[PDB]
Amino acid sequence: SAENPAEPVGALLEDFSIEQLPAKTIYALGENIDLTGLNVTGKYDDGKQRPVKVTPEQISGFSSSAPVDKQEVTITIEGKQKSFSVQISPVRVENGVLTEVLKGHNEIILPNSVKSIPKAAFRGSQINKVVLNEGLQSIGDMAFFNSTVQEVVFPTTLEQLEENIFYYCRNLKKADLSRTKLTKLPASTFVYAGVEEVLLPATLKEIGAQAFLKTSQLKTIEIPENVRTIGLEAFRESGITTVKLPNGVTTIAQRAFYYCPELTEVTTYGTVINENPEAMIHPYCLEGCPKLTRFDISKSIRILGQGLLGGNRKVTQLTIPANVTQINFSAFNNTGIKEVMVEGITPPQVFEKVWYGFPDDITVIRVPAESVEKYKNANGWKDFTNKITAF
Ligand SMILES: [Cl-]
């Protein structure tokens, strides 16, 4: 009850109209109506129009006992009635936690009261579509594990993810996370998922281990601008034909693109450079990629590991950028590379007694004209003296 009189002295409402609906039009089972945001204009018998605050006993037809897709809620004042629609979703929310999802509903629209989705909340769900609500902050482990879900709409408030959420989501065609606040895409997020397209947010800094493992339908991937790290086997056995990644990438873990049978290009973009002496493309990163013809190295990488393109024969030209300071044993060995351009005025260092950094049948190594002798006298590089020339 309001402390002060609300109605005008001497004037009675004759009619009213809903000018703005309540902000909450989606409810969970057992939730109470929330009229916040409702704007009513009353026509009074003194000719003056006035805002009307609806008192609780004036509502009828609202009931959150059972799922209802469209429920008519009526406002009754001065024998006059106006109605609006609400949806009672087949879900239970207790202290902001999605505690229950009811079966037999192919489209789930979550209420705004959902703050977190717990572990396995939609696991094995035989549903088609989920609209995640604004206000959702986190999603728990295996939340959609082996769901038949075809579409998931993500909210701008989504901040935190646990692991294996879309593992075995064979029908999830697209995951548009581009408008979320995610800084990390966790390990095994899309293993065996049918994702054809995954749009990542500008806030993303890390891609977890096996995040896109066995994504056979993923056509391409654009790694967003602020990503620093690509985890162990992040794209192992993915169907990706091309990868775009920023020049700020400092870690590409082992076998990150292992056995991608349709991968043809790895290209870089951006002018942001992150300094870190540990920045490395880890061993056998693109082993088992027989269709790869182009491999751009992130301009923030310092170290090139063993067998980066192991067994490949279609990359015939390679550019090593000026930021590379170290090349390990057999880095580009077991390849079909014929032409390498090493851009560093200062040669990358080689510490092994037996290097095999490039194949025996390499044709030429092009280095800056002012550095030809620095390369020819250097450990490792001296093994290819008769193939070194200027650019
Ligand atoms: Cl409530």
86 C-alpha to ligand 1 centroid (Å): 14
Contact between 81 and 64 under an 8 Å Cβ cutoff? The reply is no
Residue 226 has a CB neighbour count (10 Å cut-off) of 19
143 C-alpha to ligand 1 centroid (Å): 25
Q: Identity (one letter) of the amino acid at 122?
A: F
367 C-alpha to ligand 1 centroid (Å): 70
> Quick one: DSSP state of residue 377?
H
| Distance, CA of 175 to CA of 160 (rounded, Å) | 15
Q: Cβ-count burial of 369 within 10 angstroms (0-12 exposed, 13-18 middle, 19+ buried)?
A: exposed
153 C-alpha to ligand 1 centroid (Å): 24
199 C-alpha to ligand 1 centroid (Å): 35
| Residues counted in the chain | 391
| Cβ-proximal residues to 110 (8 Å cutoff; 6+ apart), any chain | 26, 89, 91, 98, 130, 131, 132, 133, 136
161 C-alpha to ligand 1 centroid (Å): 26
64 C-alpha to ligand 1 centroid (Å): 10
Could you tell me which of 85, 107, 81 has the C-alpha nearest to residue 27?
A: 85
117 C-alpha to ligand 1 centroid (Å): 18
Could you tell me which of 343, 354, 346 has the C-alpha nearest to residue 382?
A: 354
131 C-alpha to ligand 1 centroid (Å): 21
C-alpha dist (Å) from residue 377 to 123, 366, 371, 373: 61, 15, 10, 6
Biggest CA–CA distance in the chain, Å, is 105
| Distance, CA of 130 to CA of 41 (rounded, Å) | 36
| Distance, CA of 146 to CA of 169 (rounded, Å) | 5
Question: 3-class SS at 370?
Answer: helix
113 C-alpha to ligand 1 centroid (Å): 9
C-alpha dist (Å) from residue 262 to 207, 218, 238, 368: 21, 10, 8, 34
97 C-alpha to ligand 1 centroid (Å): 13
81 C-alpha to ligand 1 centroid (Å): 25
Contact between 260 and 235 under an 8 Å Cβ cutoff? The reply is yes
| Distance, CA of 388 to CA of 366 (rounded, Å) | 6
Q: How does strand 251-252 pair with strand 80-88?
A: unpaired
304 C-alpha to ligand 1 centroid (Å): 57
122 C-alpha to ligand 1 centroid (Å): 23
31 C-alpha to ligand 1 centroid (Å): 4
Phi-psi region of 215 (alpha: psi -120 to 50; beta: other; left: phi over 0): beta
30 C-alpha to ligand 1 centroid (Å): 8
Alpha carbon distance, N-terminus to C-terminus of the chain: 84
96 C-alpha to ligand 1 centroid (Å): 10
How wide is the angle at C-alpha 249 spanned by C-alphas 320 and 231, nearest 5°?
110
Structural domains for the chain: 11-89 (2.60.40.3630), 90-391 (3.80.10.10)
Resolution at which this structure was determined, Å: 2.1
Residue 2 has a CB neighbour count (10 Å cut-off) of 7
32 C-alpha to ligand 1 centroid (Å): 4
136 C-alpha to ligand 1 centroid (Å): 17
